Amino acid sequence: AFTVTVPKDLYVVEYGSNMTIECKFPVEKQLDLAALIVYWEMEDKNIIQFVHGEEDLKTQHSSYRQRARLLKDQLSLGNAALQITDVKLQDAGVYRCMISYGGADYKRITVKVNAPYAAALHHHH
C-alpha cells in the first residue's frame, strides 16, 4: 500500500546546530504537486504545511518562526526533508511527517537535543 518511510526514527542533535529530518514517500512517474500534501508537526505544533506546490505557514507554531523549511527540490524525488536551523532544547520531542499523495500515511521521529550546562540552565529558568 502507500507507505511513508523514515530512514531514521531517532535523531540526536547538538544545541545550536542545523538538522534535516528525512521522510520518504513513493513517486511513481513525474510528481503531481496539485495532489501532494505534506504536514510536518511536533507534538501538535504545526511546523510546515505544503499544499499546491507551496509552503504554507499561516498556522505554523511560533516556536519554529523563521527556523523551519521544507526542501522543495527533493520532493520530486520523494524526499520530504524538514530542515530546522539552530536547534533549541524546545525542539526535542516527537515529530510526525504526514504525507498525502494518492494515498496517505504518516510516520513518527524522535529528536533528542544535547546541550551544554549553560544552555540547559537558561532553559530550566
Ligand X SMILES: COC(=O)c1[nH]cc(-c2ccccc2F)c1N
Query: Residues interacting with ligand X, by CB under 6 A?
Result: 37, 39, 49, 98-100, 104-106
Does residue 10 bind its own copies (CB under 8 A)?
A: no
- Output the DSSP codes for 37-83: EEEEEETTEEEEEEETTEEE-TT--GGGTTTEEE-HHHHTTTB--EE
Does residue 121 bind its own copies (CB under 8 A)?
A: no
Site string (56-95) toward its own copies, x via CB under 8 A: ----------------------------------------
State which of residues 54, 103, 110, 112 lies at the interface with its own copies (CB under 8 A): 103
Beta bridge partners of 68: 84
* CB nearer to ligand X: pick between 78 and 89: 78
Nearest distance in Å: CB 53, ligand X: 14
Does residue 110 bind its own copies (CB under 8 A)?
A: no
Alpha-carbon distance of 67 to 114, in angstroms, equals: 18
**Whether the Cβ atoms of residue 68 and residue 47 lie closer than 8 Å to each other:** yes
**Whether the Cβ atoms of residue 116 and residue 15 lie closer than 8 Å to each other:** yes
107: number of CA atoms within 13 Å, CB side? 18
Does residue 5 bind its own copies (CB under 8 A)?
A: no
Binding site for its own copies (CB under 8 A): 1, 35, 37, 39, 44, 51, 98, 100, 102-104, 106, 108
